[PDB]
Design a protein around this ligand. Sequence first.
Ligand SMILES: Nc1ncnc2c1ncn2[C@@H]1O[C@H](COP(=O)(O)OP(=O)(O)NP(=O)(O)O)[C@@H](O)[C@H]1O
Lengths: 87, 93, 50, 161, 469
Amino acid sequence: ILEERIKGVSDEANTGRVLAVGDGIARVFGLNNIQAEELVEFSSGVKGMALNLEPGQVGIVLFGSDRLVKEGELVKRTGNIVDVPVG
Amino acid sequence: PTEVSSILEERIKGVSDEANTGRVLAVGDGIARVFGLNNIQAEELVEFSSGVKGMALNLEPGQVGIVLFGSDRLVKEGELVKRTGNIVDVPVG
Amino acid sequence: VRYEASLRQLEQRQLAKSVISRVQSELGNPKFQEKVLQQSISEIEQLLSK
Amino acid sequence: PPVRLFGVEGTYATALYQAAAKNSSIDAAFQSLQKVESTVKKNPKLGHLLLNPALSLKDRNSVIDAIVETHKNLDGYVVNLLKVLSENNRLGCFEKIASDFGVLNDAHNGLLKGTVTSAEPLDPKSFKRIEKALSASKLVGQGKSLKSTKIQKLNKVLEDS
Amino acid sequence: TPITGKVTAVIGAIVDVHFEQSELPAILNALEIKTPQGKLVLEVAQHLGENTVRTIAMDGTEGLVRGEKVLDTGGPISVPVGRETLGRIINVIGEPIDERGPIKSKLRKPIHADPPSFAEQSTSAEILETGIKVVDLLAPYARGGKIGLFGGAGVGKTVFIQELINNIAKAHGGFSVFTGVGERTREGNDLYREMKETGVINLEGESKVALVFGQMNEPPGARARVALTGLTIAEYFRDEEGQDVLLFIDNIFRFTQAGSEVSALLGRIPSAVGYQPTLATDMGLLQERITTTKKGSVTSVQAVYVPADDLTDPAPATTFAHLDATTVLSRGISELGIYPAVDPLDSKSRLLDAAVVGQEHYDVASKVQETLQTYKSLQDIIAILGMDELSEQDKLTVERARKIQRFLSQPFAVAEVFTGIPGKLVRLKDTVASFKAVLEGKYDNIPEHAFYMVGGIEDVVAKAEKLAA
Ligand SMILES: Nc1ncnc2c1ncn2[C@@H]1O[C@H](COP(=O)(O)OP(=O)(O)NP(=O)(O)O)[C@@H](O)[C@H]1O
């Protein structure tokens, strides 16, 4: 309990962060409550999709140019599985 | 001839009297990786605790790689594996 | 001969199944003689190899 | 030492054992390695901040140095273990380095293996033949709840015939 | 008490489950994850080491979350066997999907079971007349044998099988087990309509058939399995209730295709053409089970699909050696409008032997083939030089072969909505005589067209009189 406030490196990260991105994929760190085939939004509003979920990282397929992502970026869940307006 | 079942029970009475290795790491697709079996020969026969026999083909540094003569449903991680001390061989004549 | 062989083989298989069931039931009826014999066998085997 | 212990992942604890085996510095390394794992696993604080692929080279080194100055047993050669794993990106597998340190002390100053049921005694005398015989008789009578190997062998022989 | 794991990994149809302590579910065991829906099934494929197993899902893995609780069911996938399943439509996981309540059988059996032993084998050479000229005559099917239909897309394996169900299954008496693997749900919905109408399936009555369906919309685990469910059911009817079982699989290709679909994610180095390295033995386990044994006869027709119309693709290549009669559909032949679009030269059967069909049927066959094979040899000269460059003997053979060829075509009742002409069934004795007469040139004076798409030799003389007016 004494080593919690003694670090000082913003220990309050709830989302995930890009570990690496290339060739239309991005390997995100975290996103622990994510479900497979769920949508994800990146720091520049580019939508990805959760392909495979391993221990440690989530493989995410980009619905767009790779340029629109950077290693380090904050990634948000949608809670939606890939979906469209209808009717 | 005169109670044939009694002759088979008397001959298979005393047999198990002198039987006192590796553990399985992972098993899948006819293959079992196995930690141990240090004295084992390349191409040696091994019995798994479950009954099914196998052959050692990849004696690597950490572990041994075994092809099975059977199905594998019957082999589980950690199950004890046993040296035969023989290379695969056949009856002849 | 096929019928005589089949009958003999069925009888031997039925007798083996009944013997197996009796052996399993006896071990589950806390056997004091089995527990004492298992400790004495282990000690005798280790003294012949050392 | 002749223990093998893999050859790429298991060489992390074996590398520092060579420098810690001089001037009697192996005893203090056991209790110091356990404090690094315990304050990261059951703390929820520095785990999520260090397992990510962000931070920097300087940021990872400063976090390790600040924790070690207020924790039990970290002022000798313990500070150098954490620095090596920070720059080379190996802080995610801290449980593997601490586990492979303890196996060295227990192999060159004790027995290992097992026998039946639970664990054996793991004596530190000399030869394995004179140890196992004198410990088997004392552990069979005391305890031994017995909750089968001989029954399974007999049944298999009768079904194959 | 219950044994529960945790979802560590999801990749496509593969789920990795970690189990807390010691007792790891056996390979091939079913696992269950409770959904908001009903439940998701999983099949333990392998032990990865370190108390983790890797499973194949029997359904979609959408929405699975890492860390999820997974229940071990302590046994292979189970399926209701015996008379209770007759006229019920079934799952891969042996469940009722015919909106008609629980299949209240006595026993549930694993789908996985070892193939009948060698001592348990049982052979015989009994013809099974089909009413199909090409087959009847050239590659006779055998009662309790293994039949297979080979062909690429849209040549007609499905319609051909429906002609066999048409004839044999009606006047068969005993039990049938139809299995839809990787085909159209339309087709399966049609087959359920088709049975209730002939009365094979009687919702209020008794029933002679059973339906199991893992169709082409299913995930690869489902489709990698659904045939084993079918089989288990048939195997009961064969071994327990000592019955003659007719067992139609369509399409068996779709089982090996599914095997490859998952195989890389199972971590395997691929093999030639990108197939699972286990393609042969995974087929041997399944094929070697569909069999007649000393306890019951099984005749089985299987539909074989042929990727890219390539017969040497490693899926069908490996199949062949598992069949007793093999009958191939050529795309080219169908483009000639010849149906059934069989290959008179590639189709085989163990039963075309004088000891079985008898010297005449034997010889009417060979001579027909020589004729066709000769026509084939000349395909090139005729392609460039045409007919005028052929000799006299050659010239005749061609006109005759082209007649034999058209005569091998037969209207099918089931395919009526494609010919227009009401379908015909010729008999074995009927076919042989008919062809023998043509091979003795007793009809040479008849326009080639007469031989096309009609029944037996009587129908030829009919149509030729019709047209000669
Ligand atoms: N014996 C036949 N008589 C008339 N038409 C046929 C016959 N066999 C096939 N056809 C035609 O060919 C088409 C495909 O036949 P079908 O029985 O669906 O073959 P399939 O090879 O099983 N196709 P698929 O299952 O998609 O790979 C049908 O629409 C029929 O018109």
